[model samples]
Target: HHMSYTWTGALITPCAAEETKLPINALSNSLLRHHNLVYATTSRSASLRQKKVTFDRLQVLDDHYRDVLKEMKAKASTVKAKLLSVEEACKLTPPHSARSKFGYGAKDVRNLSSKAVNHIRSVWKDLLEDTETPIDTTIMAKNEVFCVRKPARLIVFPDLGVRVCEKMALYDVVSTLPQAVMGSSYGFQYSPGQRVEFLVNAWKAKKCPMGFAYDTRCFDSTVTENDIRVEESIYQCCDLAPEARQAIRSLTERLYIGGPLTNSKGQNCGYRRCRASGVLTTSCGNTLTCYLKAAAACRAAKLQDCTMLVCGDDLVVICESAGTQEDEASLRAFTEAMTRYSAPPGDPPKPEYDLELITSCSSNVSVAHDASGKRVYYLTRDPTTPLARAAWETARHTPVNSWLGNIIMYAPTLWARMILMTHFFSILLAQEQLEKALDCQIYGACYSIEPLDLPQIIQRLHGLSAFSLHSYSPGEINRVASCLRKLGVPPLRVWRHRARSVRARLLSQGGRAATCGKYLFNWAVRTKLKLTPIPAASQLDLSSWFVAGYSGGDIYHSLS
Candidate 1:
């Protein structure tokens, strides 16, 4: 009987004191009136999360699972991934990545300081030599909160040296293998615009489209030793050097399969016998495994014309409708098949007739109209979490600015365009920091973005239609309004008034700031300027913007 985790007496500790309440400043208060509704998660809730995630899982592989695995391995065989040089891997490390317990920091690794490079070389050699020792990983509670006060999400990562070694051996494989194996079903390959386009095309392809999102309960914990070994088997199919092959196998056995978890205080907190969240292969492995199990489940359920979009643990399936009754029965069978393969649902799957009702990756497709009175589909989500995070960011500087990410990903949304853009621009304008570069994550990769360039960035990512979008659906508007009321956020009318002022200030600056005002805040005015494609939008090298998911991979696009 294998438990997902084995806990010692040590507690999961935090490196610094955490604020449980939303720290309110004048700017945050301007956007939100009820500060009490917003809060931050702390390490105090880690024990509850530990109890919830720790469980015994049983997996039984059937012919369907074996068949899917066989097909994936066949596709994997065509891939030839080369190993990265030590210097190349070192360059991939983020500038602000955590320091190693071995006495070096990310700067040293990036600058290729002799001490860092030497230790990294030694670590690689050790991986090839000793393939049996369990690597050490640190576990900490993530600081995010919602209405019901959910348990803190745990982040597990190994030391700096092993992480770098992982890049040297498996980075190329992770980047190249998943798209080859999963093809269009891989969700991370598409930008927000492309994703919406894919969804629309897939929905239109079906005679009667039926869809639903599957939420795998504790997906990381559900990964079995057999699954990890199977993932290794697939990676081995690639053409690899002897050293690369040995390093991959060693890392799999020592770090990926199972490892001891250490707390911040250097105490042993527990042992993990499942997938590690911070490995190079985390996104790739999760996507491949999820696709494999989901494909097998779809076959077992006999769903017709199914198109799956998977991003890590998030899954959404769009298929031809088989009437309401039959669709319900089919989903039950699908759930049974997934459970048999060790992936169970958090909430029972239900058939959704409308495409917009099926949410995946925390976003849904919503309808809006452009200036030409043409229907436009865009991605959006409820504004509670974004507003809450914006409030937190206003008071305290965060490592990753969610406001910036929201603006980029949900640029066309009514909430993001009005509230998020207006609030942040007003703050940046007041502080005269419009030109300062801020860090934000897209598909888990960090990017250093300038506030003034949001117009060109949005234009490149979503197109000029984002600036002209109007006539948002009543359902979308209601959701945003309800969320504002629930979170005590200022309503749309107040945001419109604030946006006009922010827009005028931006226009006064007369350069990139004027471009931002012209393109991003066009909604604030009744007599809006004619929206046209930005000239500079074509110059942005956004080739890597949505190529893959890099959650916990320590990816920094700015460095590249």
Candidate 2:
């Protein structure tokens, strides 16, 4: 009853040649000295990861689960989601998305070519008419890395036509439903600044506040067939079109529940009985399931006034402490409750009296001083992976530039401002590609951002104070210093010197480039220019930026 996967021993093949080591180039060497420490996950490790992720999940639902489910359904019923038209859904597709086996690609679909449009319509019709035939999904390995070598992350997705169909049937539902159901607990609904604000406020709201982040071991693998059906029930509660409802129900039964996995070489890799990591509902499903289980777990533990911040599988809970010993015991009870629901912790949850110690979404709240000498709070994380990716991007071109994303998301942090912005902007200035638009993922959605507009973007997202944040906490400084030593990245002093050079180069270019230099690198110079809010920052329509996550959902926000 709990089998999550059944493998047939077929190797997960790669579509192209995979590089295990970071290729060295003049530019990459300048950014990172120890190229050996940087490596990418290739298909060689897919089997190892497969063995690790594939397992049986045992779940026992009880009263608390039922209560949380009922409450979620009640809130979900109030949402009215409209389905997207064929053209609308097609327009949402990323330009460089993988081509379908059905003779169409994302560009063709976006252009509404007769061939792509006809195929999409037929696929949608099939979804409404057929509900039992299991859909086919391509399983592959994701190329991400850390300092220590780890197994590859598996990504399972369907063809482009079905992916577009998913958007038509459920895009609006996925985007609108989660926030309504979960309220402030929905982490995707907030920007980085807002997220830090919520965390700080939540921490301060509690008396003798205690917090902990729960890491569900292989969260997607823990999802049971019952859980998928439960997720579908919540979607059905929303007011939807008759045809939309039919399509959703059919998709749920055929695709979302379980499907056959095909490797790149057209061999049957296995069958997945758990959550598909690359579906429209993947983020929403995980968030709802996690929040439901966690909310219920809080009740089971009898914790007082627990406030949760959930971003997909990442969970952070702040609550009133019932003494250190009692709080520790209560966390054990919370873990027990979560275990009974099949979402066991990777490492058991521990109570944290200091808010900075509780990490969520791979970031934590840390203290920095603004220009006015007032204590400022910002989000930051260990920079080893971001720096590693930056080094890789310097030598090789990638579809999504993680450096740009890190700069935008972690702009207020010391590493981001000092190292990431300085290093990448220097490269862009040398290549004269500051005007060229690059694609980056924010909250799992792809966005085309120009480097020239970064100063404005940073100002809008993080405020002008992001330019002048200083005197970082010793813990944050030590973490950054240790990461640099481990990865052989240049020290903070060296980055500061490089920033001054990059800052001068930008100033010489004038216009937006000068604006970037003046605002972004004010900290690197001794005689700083008076930093003011960029007038253009407020004009950009970033309404959809932080509303939802579309990681493997084939979403492009620049089109919208």
Candidate 3:
């Protein structure tokens, strides 16, 4: 039986005042105190501090500990009262949800154009003030224990806030709860129960405006502001994803059951056949252990045991964890679901998809302030496609306004923001470079990859590449940064998500582009967006990187 050990142990033979440095002296040391602190070793203690580079460890924990406790404010979790608090809410716009935007399975959240997160962020102060008690919360990584007082209001925007209530530590309690509870039960990230209900209530009040997931995943540590925070990079100011609009429970299924993964720890992450379970037969003599033999054969062949892939239709996702422990538990929970995976046969069978266990490094320069609380931009790649290349040429050379939405943005790290800014800035600057290099206003135009004389000019960048440049947002980069930080390097430069750099890219043109620029857009448009061909990148070092394989970011962009 697990013991309830929430007691504070008094120091044995406390040290004399003179021997111990005053806590105030450690104040100046940020390593000792800050809004956030990350220590990687799972088994941590003062003695272990020597193992780490902690000179002023106490002050750091004290600071973060104090911060979390103060925020938690000692509130207790409970079931939502049948008589939900009646309030007139300004419902935010529902997320954009269409069958893939103009057809099926598109990420667009909802039709009501309400920004999903903004509405919640707007009312944080009022809710916090009204909160009867501070909730209790404790955030732990492999190495460090971070504390927070709960029932605290998560102010994503002034209009959008999620009041995270304190409950019987949701992890164990909800983990044991009935499966009906969508998020908490599956060992999914976010806390379930009142926390979700509170947000749902707020959503109804706001009339369901559109919003985005400010917290990268439901579980990552996020600051709930008590005021309005507008949409920043990546999010448009209109509709949220359709999944965002539905009642929270319905959406929970999609949120928890994510899509299939293509890589597994750099070793055949791809999904193949389930040789573990061969075609069955009637009740006859014991069949040869084909499944076991096949498993051995497949492992020898270095193929993935696709029995797991059979669960692909049912996807599970976790985000931005500090270390692999969380991933371990997450995967275990997913496997538990599979233990009871047998189900009645039906059309459109469900298969489980898991995000790569490790974080996919993102590379953007948005300066969004990760938990480490610093301005470290990841080295993200920009997206590219033949159609995108043509669009760039058209935008630069011709006036018809050609842009390919098919070009996806991916990065293994968050650094891409800065890289993107630099690249885009360079592109803008290229107009002058165009005048200087090509000596004509005939800049590259729509649907054209005509060569430009700016190779030498383009060759000036420090750390990036054609194949390595992707265009995913800070979301993917956060994953990259999370993984890198685990290696005890606050500033490492490269990492990748899947085993290999090669994965299929989606195709889209853009309805907004078509409506605004009169160009084809949207996934259903099938405008042949994935047409760009890639040539090997040169090994020459620019200002940043050689643009080789190591800059582990998700968003990828390239110049042909």
Candidate 4:
């Protein structure tokens, strides 16, 4: 039997102030770093002072409470009951929620049809069966199944791309890729060595965003965007702070540790040369370092190009820079002001927008909707572009797809589409030239298989369907793995190159690549040039990206 997890603290309900969106582009991130530095100082100063006072007040309160309860209770107990010496016992670990609480888990999970995951599954179940599990869609699909894969993106936080990886500052550059993938059928495949970004658990105390897949090397499978459009939308509804706008934008523009970069000598690295050669160098070493370096560099570059939107309750819709200033200070100061003078939340609940609208707001600085609530953002980058766009698009679509992707439903003898924007298939029930078919639902079914449920004798069968599309060039896997770190997810951390014989595939001209064996690891730098680009239209996925030219390489291969 399992206990249940109760809501902790006040539900971090959507307050207008909380609804504030940060500038979702790199230019803004670059500029925001400076302001963050200052805010760190100021915020720290306040925090430090409060810490001292907090402890003192706590001690005094402790004494006063003890005195009041002294006459009311026995020596073993305090005022209400057992106080100072309550046994150090913890509550039983609660059962994993029927709902995950991530975007994948945000909706009610009881009804399988409600989730809509079956829509995508029907399209690709045949392909999925070819995957390693070869799970009989007949049995597993019919039953409620909550399964995850190795090197899976696990969850994604597209909104935070610019914040964590400053390379994503230009919305115009990277917005299209993920949005496009959102409409893909096979886009959900992932592994331990790939990366993705998507809208996720933004309000969790840990800020756990939803990563579609996961890997062992990765610590957590989640991350969040600053929600700049939320701020702008709030501002559109009311007046917003100019300084507020600047602060958010500054972060997107900061120069980070690594990127499509050059060596200290400033010459194009092998990878940069590849990009110029029309070859996409998807994998690299030390991706986080370059990601961080690029952010740092952008900060120093001071290309103040960003802007934002916030609302009445200091609900910021977006905080971006318009590239109008040559001086970084102007941008930093303005943003700092916004951060400092944020309006307090109104004592109320507000749900003006749905999840998708809320998510897009963080990507493109400007968030607008059609009469039907379809969102269109004024992006600095396209989603599918090489750098920033890829990051955001990866986040928005991938993780969301996992939960909302291939939900299948079988009416025994029929198949049907459910709800708004859902396409479903049931091959056995009907006659469609489907490669493979299974039973699944949009939302997973509420009931689950019980373990006792183990039979004394089990029959076994095998098929080669599992690892088919998982054939990723090691390099592409590494590239995505590196990016996923910020999304709170990652894939395996290894140093392997594309095959030389395969040339265009990850094997590259050289069969193997070098992985670090020791030393510190930079989570966001990608510089090892793909000696050759992998030509297959395979997916990128992973677990972790670790120390490059440094830490020892451990081979980790699975779904990405």
Candidate 5:
């Protein structure tokens, strides 16, 4: 029997006062005191969500939504699915994915052992053979936001056995087909870089009408059984094996439509009636449906030049501003139209008159100073999450350090370079793990990152602009400075000093390492440094499929 525990009160631990330097640190103490509370609230939230999502009645689908699905399905029907080899499908399983209950780990599954491989094929076959069978889901909790004290949300993903088959069956279809059907409106295809570029260009394309981000509360919870079946219908439109078609339907009804949630303890939490957070198709489905509903609603609301940028449930709109009174009326109409379509905003969608004020995908444009103190504008978000993960990285071994991913994605941000890069590398350097390449994910794909490769990675990821940035907005600068104090992190000046010495060491190494130091740490030098492409970038064509891939140019444009 599993013994699951929950705390009714705060977790207090006795510690030596003088030994701990950051006794009163806000960031440190807040997290420390809430550690047990975090766990308790997260667990309680899981149970609550499970009951609300699984036991509660689901949203009903209407004819308009059905018509949209019919059209989407028609588009999906044109594509052909080429079945993947067992090895190919197995390879898609993440390196750090949870182990199987059957005693086979991710490594064994990837190695194509008959025990694991044949099992997946059998599961696929069974899915094809069975129509009414229900695929149970594993329920776990994930901390959605890093800094907040809210409970961790429940994530119901398919069991590992079926998940591997999901990759075999739907990975390619979902990744490639969503964009095919949704076009530029497809949310999952772009990185933060491309996303920001799209936003800027789209805003400029409209001469900067008022823009604001819209969020839908409990988005996945709103997805209905009919909604899931419609997605399956779309997938079935493609030329697939008869078995594959049946398998798709079976999987949807069993796991997708509603599945019993089994928590960490050997207990039945409940049944889920909505989209589970951890599925391969989760992002694609949400983006497609959200875009479809929003697009139709925009037309109904009669908003002019309404350009929407959606990343899953996160949406930002740039449309011509009617006068304030007229804009409020339009927003209300838009909200009504969306609610009519069952895609209601979590809170009423509010419009920001300033372009810089809108935050989407948890990122907003911010400014910071370069060595020369000239102004530098770039994309950034709160560093709370990165700092939290950095603390975790400092204390323990994790499957993947989120700090590295953030550093890669937000390489141009002052907080990323000055704080994340400094803190992580300092730890790695002290631990003598600078040469250790760790895996991290960005834009839903994984890559290997090493501290020594920072220069090349930064150059390729963010370009030379990362090192030459100047002045920051007062708001952004204040936040960064405040965060450093709260987290007990050293000031940016210290990082600059370290970067100078680190740059010299890198240059002495001679080769890619030297190039990384020069371009990546160009700010650390008194004189401006020139850069050439990281030799590995071209040699590996890393941009095409790996990190900073789109920086080579727009993937959408390069398609031709």
Candidate 6:
């Protein structure tokens, strides 16, 4: 018999029965089980994590937080916050999203059925009515790393109706409002390319530039009850409806400030007063609060002209580095200031001369080869999670294809174009579902993407030069090797070999298939064909597909 396990951490609760909506799970597992021909395979890595334990302690917010809040609210005075329409908010609810227990499905919710609309109104009314009652959140285990056998992260999300309300009340306000006040310093506004460009430009401005990623230890936990109230205070600076203001305050007390966490076995896991990972505001709040705290801390530490790039808890500071002794002393001051502000670094932040040394969003700029075997710089990561998810998608019922998402975002990379595209599209072709447009989230938001449009996507996103890169970092090469071995996937050489035949097979099919073959598998072909615009791709403006920005090129070369 298996024994029960207890989680020591305050925020991370063990998955229990109450952690899921029984109706929703029953529907997916029983009623709609065969809606798709997907299956689940056991992941060696995910299993390995379940046996191990140790998570960061929850944070208690303190006074230095107040000073930063006062300053950020003052900045908010210069901007106007706009309210989102109820219809617009509903649209943000992703297609194939989990069904609501209040009598409507995802389809009906999107279609704005009277039943769904009435149910949402009731939920919103309940939010306004119940100011002090704690809104419970479901906690579940999710994959943090790809193939590693470690415990999954504890994710917290609310009921379906509440998620929509979250979008209407806070989502747009945070996403758009911060950038107006903070400009480029607001990290969520830019894409990977734009972020890289910022680093390059900032480095050039300072003779002795120093950079390091500042990771806030359990960042969400540090956001106290008082901290959330302060956020609401900032929102109040905007001319909001009386209903909106009351609803916001109620939401803060019920859900944001503190909430009960229930697990799968119907166990009361714990309560979280900090920022929950599943909320729409998690990214925005973390980025906003982190920026405010770091900004204030930088000032207190007396760092000259410290330019900060913060994306949620992931931060990089570029500032003038003093000599070793002064630098050490300054670093100490920075740490102290952050601690005072209730934001402590997970690891001691060390100043680095090279921007390339800094990693953010689990991604780093790395060298890799393109189809032409030329050297190029592309954004890459360890690929462990992507591979793990890809393995899962091969045998599981997933709303999105993890492999296709990877291929789209990192299409120029040797592994993505050859391995991921070849593998997934090959399967899709066999299943005769190649023409279906699937949804994938890139950056933060979702988009309807098709495999056929990948060539255009790669060309526009990474540029044509991306296809010819032929270099990779030692870390990059090694991670790739380790990931393949762990996931039982074949080596890159094998993928390249398979691509040769996959390319030939596609070309033989002709018509639309010929176009897909040419754009997708051009690298593997004897002689690559000239590009042509895809009809599907031509219909939509791609500028809006990604989070936004990029394409200055080769910071290393330019700076050198």
TM-score of each: 0.97, 0.98, 0.19, 0.17, 0.84, 0.80
Please provide the root mean square deviation of candidate 4 (C-alpha atoms, Å).
27.6
Better candidate number, 3 or 4, judged by lDDT: 3
**Which regions of candidate 4 are displaced past 4 Å?**
1-108, 112-328, 343-560
Model 1 CA RMSD to the hidden true structure, in angstroms = 1.5
RMSD of each candidate? 1.5, 1.3, 28.0, 27.6, 6.9, 8.5
lDDT of each: 0.88, 0.90, 0.20, 0.19, 0.64, 0.63
Candidate 2 lDDT over residue span 1-560, tens digit each? 56889999999999999888888899998888899988899899999999888898999999999999999999999999998999999988888888999998889998999999999999999999998899999999988755567988999999999999999999899889998999999999887888888888999988789999999999999999999999999999999999899999999999999999999999998999999999988889999999999999999999999999888888989999999999989999999999999999999998999999888888888998998887889999999889999999888999888899899999999999999999988988988899999998888878889888888888878777888898999999999999988888888899999999999999999999999999989989999999877997888888767645445847887712
Quality of model 3 by C-alpha lDDT:
0.20
Once superposed on the true structure, which residue ranges of model 1 sit more than 4 Å away at CA?
547-553
* Ranking of predictions according to TM-score: 2, 1, 5, 6, 3, 4
- Residue-pair clashes, model 3: 188
lDDT of 3 at 64: 27
The stretch of ten residues in a row with the least summed lDDT in candidate 1 is 544-553
Candidate that beats the other on lDDT, 2 or 5, i.e. the better one: 2
Alpha carbon deviation, residue 61, candidate 6 (Å)? 9.2
- Clash count list over all predictions: 0, 0, 188, 213, 12, 27
Quote the lDDT for 521 in model 3. 14
Error (Å) of candidate 6 at residue 244 is 2.7
Which lDDT value does model 1 have at 505? 90
Best by lDDT: 2
Identify the superior model by lDDT, candidate 1 or candidate 5: 1
Badly placed stretches (over 4 Å) of model 5 are: 1-45, 48-71, 143-145, 367-377, 542-560
Q: lDDT per residue, candidate 6, 1-560, as tens digits? A: 11112343434333322211112233123212222222222222233332332233333433545576676777777666555566766766676665665677766767787887777778888987888888877766663323322344456677678877876676556656677656788775654445556667786699788776788776766666666676667766766667777778888888876687765455776666567777766666677778877887777777766888877777878889886667778878888878766677788888777766777778776666555565556677766566555655564556655677688677756667767777776777777877678766665556667666666566656666555555667777787777666555677777777777777877888866666687777777667776554555444464333331111000000000
The lowest-lDDT stretch of 10 consecutive residues in candidate 6 is 551-560
Q: What digit string (tens of lDDT, one per residue) describes model 1 on residues 312-411? A: 8889999999899999999999999999998999999989988888888888899988888888899999888888888888988888788898899899
- Name the 10 consecutive residues with the lowest summed lDDT in model 3: 277-286
